[PDB]
Amino acid sequence: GELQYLRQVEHILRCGFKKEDRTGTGTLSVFGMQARYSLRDEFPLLTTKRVFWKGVLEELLWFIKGSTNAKELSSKGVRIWDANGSRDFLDSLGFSARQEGDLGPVYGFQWRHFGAEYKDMDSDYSGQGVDQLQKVIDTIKTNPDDRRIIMCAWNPKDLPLMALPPCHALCQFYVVNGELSCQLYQRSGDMGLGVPFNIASYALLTYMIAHITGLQPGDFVHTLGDAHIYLNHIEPLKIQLQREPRPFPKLKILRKVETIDDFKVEDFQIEGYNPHPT
Amino acid sequence: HGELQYLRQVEHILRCGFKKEDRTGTGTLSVFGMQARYSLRDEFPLLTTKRVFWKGVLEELLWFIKGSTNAKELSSKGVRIWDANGSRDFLDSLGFSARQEGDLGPVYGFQWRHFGAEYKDMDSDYSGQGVDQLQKVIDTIKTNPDDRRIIMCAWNPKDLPLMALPPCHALCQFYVVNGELSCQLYQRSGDMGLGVPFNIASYALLTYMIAHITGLQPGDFVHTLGDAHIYLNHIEPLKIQLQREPRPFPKLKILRKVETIDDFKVEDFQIEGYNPHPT
Ligand SMILES: O=c1ccn([C@H]2C[C@H](O)[C@@H](COP(=O)(O)O)O2)c(=O)[nH]1
Ligand SMILES: O=c1ccn([C@H]2C[C@H](O)[C@@H](COP(=O)(O)O)O2)c(=O)[nH]1
Numbered sequence A: 001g002e003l004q005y006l007r008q009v010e011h012i013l014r015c016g017f018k019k020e021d022r023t024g025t026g027t028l029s030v031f032g033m034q035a036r037y038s039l040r041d042e043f044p045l046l047t048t049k050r051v052f053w054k055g056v057l058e059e060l061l062w063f064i065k066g067s068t069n070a071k072e073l074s075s076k077g078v079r080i081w082d083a084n085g086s087r088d089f090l091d092s093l094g095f096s097a098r099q100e101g102d103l104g105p106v107y108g109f110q111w112r113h114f115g116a117e118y119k120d121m122d123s124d125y126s127g128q129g130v131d132q133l134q135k136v137i138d139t140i141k142t143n144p145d146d147r148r149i150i151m152c153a154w155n156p157k158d159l160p161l162m163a164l165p166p167c168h169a170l171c172q173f174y175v176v177n178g179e180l181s182c183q184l185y186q187r188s189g190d191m192g193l194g195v196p197f198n199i200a201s202y203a204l205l206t207y208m209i210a211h212i213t214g215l216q217p218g219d220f221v222h223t224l225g226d227a228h229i230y231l232n233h234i235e236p237l238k239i240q241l242q243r244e245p246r247p248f249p250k251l252k253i254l255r256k257v258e259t260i261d262d263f264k265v266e267d268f269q270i271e272g273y274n275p276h277p278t
Numbered sequence B: 001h002g003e004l005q006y007l008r009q010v011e012h013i014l015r016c017g018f019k020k021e022d023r024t025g026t027g028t029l030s031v032f033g034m035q036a037r038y039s040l041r042d043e044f045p046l047l048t049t050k051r052v053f054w055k056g057v058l059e060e061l062l063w064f065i066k067g068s069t070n071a072k073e074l075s076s077k078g079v080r081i082w083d084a085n086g087s088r089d090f091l092d093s094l095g096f097s098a099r100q101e102g103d104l105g106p107v108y109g110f111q112w113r114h115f116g117a118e119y120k121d122m123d124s125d126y127s128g129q130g131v132d133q134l135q136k137v138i139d140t141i142k143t144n145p146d147d148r149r150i151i152m153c154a155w156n157p158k159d160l161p162l163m164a165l166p167p168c169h170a171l172c173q174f175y176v177v178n179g180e181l182s183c184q185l186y187q188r189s190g191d192m193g194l195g196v197p198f199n200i201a202s203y204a205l206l207t208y209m210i211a212h213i214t215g216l217q218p219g220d221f222v223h224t225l226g227d228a229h230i231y232l233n234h235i236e237p238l239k240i241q242l243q244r245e246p247r248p249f250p251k252l253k254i255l256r257k258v259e260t261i262d263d264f265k266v267e268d269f270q271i272e273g274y275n276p277h278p279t
């Protein structure tokens, strides 16, 4: 399973093109890649380098409750978003009137309130917009054959208000033989840092919705747009390709949860996770 | 040959797909998640193991580009693909009895050109309303080709109930390197035996058109599928089609220097050397 992520890193090193980027540092880049990670009795937390699993779980819980407030997640000891909610960064984009921590209408707003008129991170959006997360869950229960089970965070109208455009433009869910699968469209992926994390996020989400829907986790299909490696991270990765992968951990949910909103941190345990050091 | 990828995908579905049902109850063999890369360098991926309705491809795309959501405006060009979904009965079944025949709702033409504006009807004037995604994409390719956010999104959860059909082509993304423009389509649902060859041609063409406008060379079309399926009653014709050897892809020529995307006309295009197997 992890071989696919390794083979993808190798491919970019062996066939990617040099491509400048917004940061001016430069990458090796391939456009268009796809990998399928089984979720059947294992969880694809990568072993050839440690993934910040606390961040994955708490960020997803943050997403689910609809929050666009970087402080709400920082208080969990996960600071991924803090720099994009900083005062100077928000002023850098003309959001002087904004409060620090207000990320705009990012994933939380889009997943729970798509199409609603955003104001600030403290506003009350109850009943406003499309609750895509719950629509997906209802459709899985009532019509698992549906080929439109999509959750879309890419919102062209809200893009100017987001602190940064979402990398995870949309995901699609699928059911056959009582198995729940998920395909992520990730428009831009840093193989050295973001991507192993993002694989965890959406595999976790698939586990959660399969639990709520009475289904088994199936496959997680990861589809990349610009899949890249920053030039200054080539040497760490070449070392990492050398390290042989140890079997994927497993994920256990310690109690029968009924709604996606009822999940909490202590309902999840990663057992068997032996990553290589870095 | 790039058509071999399509053929291997068809074969993979017949050998490993799962017999899953669908909304029409007809029954399919289905695989969730596939990807193919069709080179666009000095050839056009118009499939040869079965003829593709190229006229339909060109006219539909031109219809999409000028923002239309009236099925009759495409029908009047000889392309009847959308007519059934704008019929009187079909519109009345969805709850659109106050809509004129042919009013498909905020489908692709509206989303590409006016994303976020309030849909009234097909004859409304939407000038300046919503996000012009198609032109934003063209602009970004020119001013900042390294950008990793060049996306055109037709999936609009707010507008979905207003549409005659939910779009199969949720979004596409463009990419520039080495003076070459590539395109990835996320297609949520794909009939391998009818729509898919057509869909591959649609977005390859769109890539040719936007490359022309931005002074770039077509690179790759990357085709990504969610539910890739074959209908049970089409298994036998496809398995005969799989033993046919593909002929070289035709070439597409653009017969004139065009400045803006709105300025393309049907006569600007010529498919040369298209020799598909008969049926
Ligand atoms: O969940 C995420 C978020 C960001 N990135 C990486 C990819 C890019 O290197 C950078 C985002 O920059 P842009 O694609 O917007 O230019 O961060 C990820 O890999 N995963
Ligand atoms: O451009 C298109 C439009 C439709 N279809 C096929 C896919 C499905 O077989 C059917 C659409 O029905 P749903 O995916 O919404 O269920 O038509 C395509 O392949 N390409």
Ligand SMILES: Cc1cc(NS(=O)(=O)c2ccc(N)cc2)no1
Residues within 6 Å of the ligand: A052, A055, A080, A081, A084, A164, A190, A193, A194, A195, A197, A198
């Ligand atoms: C915003 C924003 C940045 C971001 N980065 S990321 O690439 O997801 C990431 C993941 C883990 C760690 N430790 C750092 C960064 N995700 O959202």
Ligand SMILES: Cc1cc(NS(=O)(=O)c2ccc(N)cc2)no1
Residues within 6 Å of the ligand: B053, B056, B081, B082, B083, B085, B165, B194, B195, B196, B198, B199
């Ligand atoms: C409506 C509607 C159907 C549809 N399917 S399709 O795949 O575009 C298609 C292409 C050619 C033919 N002959 C029939 C259908 N796209 O929009």
